[PDB]
């Protein structure tokens, strides 16, 4: 339909243009000049090709469409107007910037308006990382590009676990090699029985001999692909090492692999080229020499949102922190009435100036005073804000400053918030605060590393060994007494032989001293490297020193492999928020990983893009996103489609949220169908990769299968036909639930932890079957969750006494499948009871638990991963139905040997979790500033130490868990 | 002096209530509690110095207590009093933490009103978030109006310019073209720019009103919060009696 576009000719006369809502830009331009031919002063106008369009978007920014074939709806222009001017920029540059801006969600020009020098230095200097990654991508093309786009999905363990080794017959796996090399697709099948240790080239050669229906002896001209998805075997690894082959071995499934030609894949992959963007072009005294105390002038607060009558007086809390350690006591200003927040006071601190560590962070807060409730006046922060006392170039901050104050985080009653972000609130309607810092007649900066080396060497048995070994094995959250700290500091030169002691010895040092920290720096310089599961802790709130995190990052560089990196990626993305500057070593590590492995890049992008809606890290993650999109290669277009699809979905649910809140199920369904039938919706929602898994493509939607649930949430079911020709081998339909209104980062954390529990149980020698199904959060209360096939809730199974579930399992597994079904049910139940107890998940009714037809059992929804209640708390008590299924329907469920082996597996699982509890502690401690209500305030993380009984010995924990189980079911 | 009656001894394995009690308290405040390692005989001591809760372990051997071997004190109370009189050298011990129907009804009422204030605080927080989102979208719309006004402004400037000159009198080609179409075209142009500037102005006024509402919501939330913390503390300290 016509929208009466107002066109702005170079002369200036407005043109009333009528065009269809779906119209190409060039057609509108041609029609505009055709109409201007009727308009006066047409002779002044130049040729059509020379000019170009300009419009203002709803994002309050202007864009000049250099080469746009998009529709009017795709232009998303704020007002129906179209300026015509002579273009001046570059076509490729502007189109790339538009693409990056649509991927991030905010225009790239806003990052240019930001005049903060650290932002510009970051943007100019991270391009070295981008370019080096791109150059690495092109070292051995098209092989290197093939590795980039399709990376090997391999385990880090080449040596097979003994249980799945026994699952294989003599270590021989039978694989169905499908070859479609023919004038028409006919699906030639060759059955192979080969050892699991054979490299892909041996599979290729032996399958070639099989296809020769004799033994011919092609050579270097063939590769393998997983049937039903875009997974490929290009790297010389044991065939078992790939996750598809291990999954087939463990689940007893038949592995199907297509044999394909290298040239088809090589043609499928376009070239990746990176070009420098436009922004690629644009007295000091040592801190130790200054002899004075820290002293900062609090000038005034512009305004605070506190009642004059309700609240009598306000003051400002301050501090000098280093991580979470106050380097000295807090100072206050004298209380003033709320009307006139003027202090103008030189607050002074016990900390000596050279005694300042490189990571000091002078936290603030505007706080209230109220004596009506009691003599001890209650103090609550009206607002807060942090300042790094050093600049990105090592210089101590001087002069005046103005800080906007963030609101207090919900549920945080501590006056200061030294966990929060170190910068001003971008909003300028917030309360501000003027400060001013000491001037030393010169710019003063932290000493270089060589001076710290020079300071040392001048500033500085069996029972000891046993105590050191006992300390090293202790929990990271284990309380350390001062005697232990003095012992740790005394024998540091012997603590270096025990490299597991670095996270402990670090908390032994007083960062106040200038003498101790030089010695600690030398120690970290010569510290032997440690395992990446322990060097990850050194990247958290409590270890903010540059040398500490440099050591941790170089250890991950030497030892972290891409299998685990994809697993601990959420934690590292969240630990980015704990870094002090913009351009650090962790961000370069993560970027160089995401720019050499599209598996890492896809989820890196989606995690950051999810965390773009928080204003505290929106700027950091936006700069990171724009750098990635500069050098992400050809995947960006795909990402856009995903984003486009997601946007449409969110929009639909938005119309469901308010317009369709009060209408019934049938009318909401018919309106949903009407919204689906729109051709733009079909174009956006089909033909793109998946956010949950890049390897699985989504195809044409199935409008009949897509439907809106009748549950209270009302999410959406979306079904996609698989584009791959081998749709039957893997799965016909990809089904996903889109939820708009539920936080799904807690669910991601729970499912991840379930995955590591399953991995350690399998590695030990225990086969407890878990379902860590895919989950993704891409925004605020926006998420995608996978669908599990042939699964029904306990309520659904029971509806369709105590024997109903076992009767259903018998009907679905009558025959020889009975015993294997019962065994899988027992092992799945053991694993999930252990996991839900240890993590203390919420109340699990029937709807929370589902059972497949195979026999597996699993839990679907989460949200209390540390018992968000006040504070033990066995949520999942074994229902009598569960016991009946465990012991094969015997009435005396407790008095069976099946129940004895069930309990023994539970005990072994509990111990298995307890030896690795350090990993769970670290992974939970990396999620403190995430904003999840459940995982702030270490009082929450101490739940995972209460349910794992870390202070006691394994025998006390054994007795505690036995008592917990005995109470739970209580005979059913 | 016997233990189990001293002020500093609190008892069980709470472990974190010590952090709450010692936080935001004067330097030298201390606590002694037996937990976190073994059933009895641990007796750790939390001393607040430099804003930090230092932990000191009380070793027990041969019926004697003491911070480090050799142990010269008899009971916990003797050690506590001896280090209250004399410094640890690093600060001597300064500040020790210390009908049925009526108290039961008071506790029940406090729980009920705590629930009331918690729900009120949640409603205030959700209103705060909604108003913040409205403020951000209104600021974006104001910036969009600013850009549109600017672009229409140089469009209008270019129009008048060319028009005024190219078409001035009968001597030019425009004998009556100006009156015929072009003055009306410029009239529509100025009407459009006036409409857009009026929309920008009224939306700035709406944004100012929304900002005032935001300020009021923040004031109400910030006044109601500390009362909520005080009521939570009172409810906790009556529940600690549980008798």
Residue numbers in the entry:
A (entry chain A): 18 to 234, 246 to 310, 323 to 500, 524 to 863, 873 to 943, 950 to 1050
B (entry chain B): 326 to 414, 421 to 429, 441 to 585
The authors write:
Of special interest is PI3K alpha (PI3Kα), a heterodimer of p110α and p85α. Cancer-specific mutations in p110α, such as H1047R, result in constitutive PI3Kα signaling, contributing to tumorigenesis by sustaining aberrant AKT-mTOR pathway. For example, the small-molecule activator UCL-TRO-1938 (referred to as 1938 hereafter) selectively enhances PI3Kα activity, demonstrating cardioprotection against ischemia-reperfusion injury and promoting nerve regeneration in preclinical models. Here, we present cryo-electron microscopy (cryo-EM) structures of wild-type (WT) PI3Kα in complex with the activator 1938, the unliganded PI3Kα H1047R mutant, and the PI3Kα H1047R mutant in complex with 1938 at resolutions of 3.17 Å, 3.09 Å, and 2.94 Å, respectively.
Compound 1938 dose-dependently increased the kinase activity of the PI3Kα H1047R mutant with an EC50 value of 22.4 μM. The 1938-bound PI3Kα H1047R structure more closely resembled that of the unliganded PI3Kα H1047R, with a Cα RMSD of 0.60 Å, lower than that for the 1938-bound PI3Kα WT (0.99 Å). Different from the unliganded PI3Kα, the sidechain of R1047 in the 1938-bound PI3Kα H1047R structure aligned with that observed in the unliganded PI3Kα H1047R, interacting with T972, Q981, N1044, and F977. The mutation‑initiated rearrangement at position 1047 is accompanied by increased mobility of kα11 and a slight inward shift of kα10 (residues 1016–1025) and the adjacent loop (residues 1005–1016) in the 1938‑bound PI3Kα H1047R complex compared to the 1938‑bound PI3Kα WT. Concurrently, F1016 moves 1.90 Å (Cα) closer to the allosteric binding pocket of 1938, which may underlie the comparatively weak cryo‑EM density for 1938. In addition, the activation loop exhibits subtle repositioning: D933 (DFG motif) shifts 1.0 Å (Cα) toward the ATP site, and K942, a residue critical for substrate engagement, displaces by 3.0 Å (Cα). Notably, the shortest distances were observed in the BYL-719-bound WT PI3Kα (5.7 Å) and the BYL-719-bound PI3Kα H1047R (8.1 Å), consistent with the presence of the inhibitor. This is followed by the unliganded WT PI3Kα (9.2 Å) and 1938-bound WT PI3Kα (9.9 Å), while both the unliganded PI3Kα H1047R (11.0 Å) and 1938-bound PI3Kα H1047R (11.7 Å) showed significantly larger distances, indicating a more open conformation favoring enzymatic activity. Looking at the p110α−p85α interface, the iSH2 domain shifted by 2.0 Å at the Cα atom of I521 in comparison to the 1938-bound WT, and by 4.4 Å compared to PI3Kα H1047R. This suggests that the 1938‒PI3Kα H1047R combination further disrupts the inhibitory contacts between p85α and p110α to enhance the kinase activity. In agreement with this, our MD simulations showed that the p110α−p85α interface area for the 1938-bound PI3Kα H1047R is the smallest (5283 Å2), compared to the 1938-bound WT (5400 Å2) and unliganded PI3Kα H1047R (6315 Å2), reinforcing the synergistic effect of 1938 and H1047R in reducing the autoinhibition of p85α on p110α.
